[PDB]
Each structure stands twice: as C-alpha cells, then as structure tokens.
Amino acid sequence: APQQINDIVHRTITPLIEQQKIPGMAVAVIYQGKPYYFTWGYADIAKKQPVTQQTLFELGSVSKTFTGVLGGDAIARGEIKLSDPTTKYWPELTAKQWNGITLLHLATYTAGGLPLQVPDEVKSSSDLLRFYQNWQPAWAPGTQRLYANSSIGLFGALAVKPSGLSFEQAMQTRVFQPLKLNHTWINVPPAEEKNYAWGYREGKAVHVSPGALDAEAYGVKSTIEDMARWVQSNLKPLDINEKTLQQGIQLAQSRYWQTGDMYQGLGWEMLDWPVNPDSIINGSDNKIALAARPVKAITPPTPAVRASWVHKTGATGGFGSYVAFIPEKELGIVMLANKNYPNPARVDAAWQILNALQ
Ligand SMILES: O=C(O)[C@@H]1CCCC[C@@H]1c1n[nH]c(=S)[nH]1
Ligand SMILES: O=C(O)[C@@H]1CCCC[C@@H]1c1n[nH]c(=S)[nH]1
C-alpha cells in the first residue's frame, strides 16, 4: 500500500487495539476503488492462529446490508413491492395491528416498535407467528424508528417467499455468487472452519448462538477480502452485470426516512457528505442508535445520493464490525474485530482514516 494509507491506518488502529484490548483485527481501505489490507493479532488465542486475509469474522448486524440488498434485488425482479402489506406474504398474520404495516415499515424499523430482540423462547414458525400476532405496537406505522432484528429479520424472511428459495439459497445465488463473495457464509461449512475466528467476550471464546431470524438480521460471516469486495460493489453498483442486483444495491441506498441528520435505507444508513464526525461518532453510540426516534417520511424516497457517508455498525457477543464508504470519493473502509467494542470507537477510527485520504 502507499505509505500514506499505511501510516494513517497504523497510527489509528494500533492505539485502538491497545485501548480496546482487541485480540485480532482486519482492516480494508478502498482507495480510488482499490483495496488495501491490514491484519493484527489472533483469530484464535489458544491455538495461536493469527488473523489473515482469509480469516472469517462474524459480521453481526452488518449482515443487514446484505438482507437489504437481497430485498432490493427482489423488488427489481418484480417479486415484491415495499408498498405491499406484510399480510400479502404471511396470510396467517391476521391480528388487526398488522393492517397498514408494509414491507417498507419492516425493512426500515418503522412498523411501530417491534422489539430489538426476538425472544429466546421463540424458535419455530409457530412460535414466530404467535410472537408477531401478540405483539402490540407502541406507535402507528411510519411514525417512529426503533432499530430491531425482529423488524428487518421478518422483512428478509418475507422478501424471499415469492422466489421459492430459502433465505440462504436466495442470498447465495442472487448476491454472494454474482459478486464473487466465495468466502462469505450464513452457515460456515466444515471445510472452512479452519479459518473461522473465535469471538471473545469477557475473555471467553464464543461463536454466535442460533436464534430465530438470525440469518436475516445478524448471521453472515465473511473475510476482509470479501468485505472489501462488498464495499466495492456498493460503491460502484453500475459495474455489476446482473441487472436486478445492480438495481437492488441502488434501492438499498435510497433514503426512505430521516431522523436527525441520518437517513434510513435498506440495511444501509446514510448521511450527507461532508458529514459532521460528532454526528456519526456520537450517533453510533447505542444510547442514540437503539433509541426510539420520530421519523420524517422522504416522499418519495431519494435515489442513492453519491455525496453520502454510507455505513453500518454490527456486533455479535464476541465480534465488532464496521463498514463505511463515500461513493463520491471512491473511498471506503471495513473494520472487522473478534471483540465487541464500543461503536463510537469504531466510527472515530474510520472517520480519522477516511478524512485523511479524502
Ligand atoms: O449488532 C448489533 O450491534 C445489534 C445491537 C444491539 C442488539 C442486537 C445486536 C447485537 N449484536 N451483538 C450484540 S451483544 N447485540
Ligand atoms: O447474544 C447476543 O448478545 C447477541 C444476540 C443477537 C445478535 C447476536 C449476538 C450473539 N449471539 N451469540 C453470540 S456469541 N452473540
């Protein structure tokens, strides 16, 4: 890499790893559309396995960007519409609170207070139907945003229904394969387990637990190389040869709602560039990011604005990730770690790096 990228990356990440006691880390910078990789520390402490460009990390909620793009692709295919009622795709959802709740609402966390977490007790499709039927909204549809795995998780599950494919098969065939993300998995195969990093929580080695709607909301594992490729595809969707996927990426970066200075897309969240770093850094803290906030509808939604800071934080019990890019500048970053450390520390590191290279 050029010495400039090398120096800002190392001057930013070394202190971060030290301060946050991160066991292992991988970073990709996309600069003028080209990837540069960096690795530190351990994928497995006990077995002394280093982090490499082939190490798989749990993306956690960064998975929602894939779910948003898969959904966008389904729209482009004419299989679903964001304006469709939820009940169109799940007829057994007959409780009257679901009247007026559309796939847009589910995708953008504005259904009216669907919970952050699907309860642990909810396993089967039966359990799930019962859970959503009994769910009582706090607000009317399209009035407040409350970030929720049970919202976009349901979107993902319903969005692939017309295709006839499982969510995994839909994602593999329609997103991972076309984009050559050949080391990106919802379920890590035995052949790839050698590369699967351990997560670390209070010093214990942990992997993500199975849960309802896990694949759709937080279930993707990937390498720094594939994630750089994911950023490149979202930076430059017009280079993608599959028409519906190209279109779906653009729909995921459309601005559907505004709260404060952030805009909600499908998975992705966006701010106008130039951004105020205090807004993204402080905004990434869960005191704001998980808070219930009123939303203003963008009527109709704004197509993907090139002059945007487009990003997503993501965590599991043992992992902490961040992706951010600025289409206007052919510039982006992926930060993958096997500890869940505070979001603002991630966004601060990212902004220092990208601001320096912009
Ligand atoms: O990925 C995130 O950051 C989410 C936000 C908080 C609750 C649900 C998710 C979560 N992932 N890992 C843990 S712990 N929680
Ligand atoms: O347990 C949590 O805090 C989270 C539950 C929702 C997102 C995924 C996280 C997770 N599950 N198992 C491991 S490790 N992390």
Side-chain angles (χ1 to χ4, degrees), residues 201 206-209 218 316-318:
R201 179 171 186 170
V206 298
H207 277 150
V208 62
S209 282
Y218 57 85
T316 65

Side-chain angles (χ1 to χ4, degrees), residues 56-67 167 171 176 181 183-188 196 208 214-223 227 230 316 319 321:
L56 296 170
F57 291 81
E58 295 177 1
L59 301 185
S61 291
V62 169
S63 304
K64 292 171 174 82
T65 67
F66 289 100
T67 301
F167 182 86
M171 187 71 68
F176 299 163
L181 311 184
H183 298 86
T184 299
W185 317 99
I186 286 157
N187 293 291
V188 179
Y196 189 11
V208 62
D214 56 3
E216 298 83 351
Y218 57 85
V220 182
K221 305 85 186 179
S222 193
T223 69
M227 291 303 291
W230 181 233
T316 65
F319 290 80
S321 70

Side-chain angles (χ1 to χ4, degrees), residues 59-62 64 116-117 147 149 201 217-218 286 290 312-319 340 343 346:
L59 301 185
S61 291
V62 169
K64 292 171 174 82
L116 179 51
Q117 305 118 142
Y147 184 88
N149 294 333
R201 179 171 186 170
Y218 57 85
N286 288 335
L290 303 178
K312 188 74 189 70
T313 55
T316 65
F319 290 80
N340 179 8
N343 288 337
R346 309 188 203 159

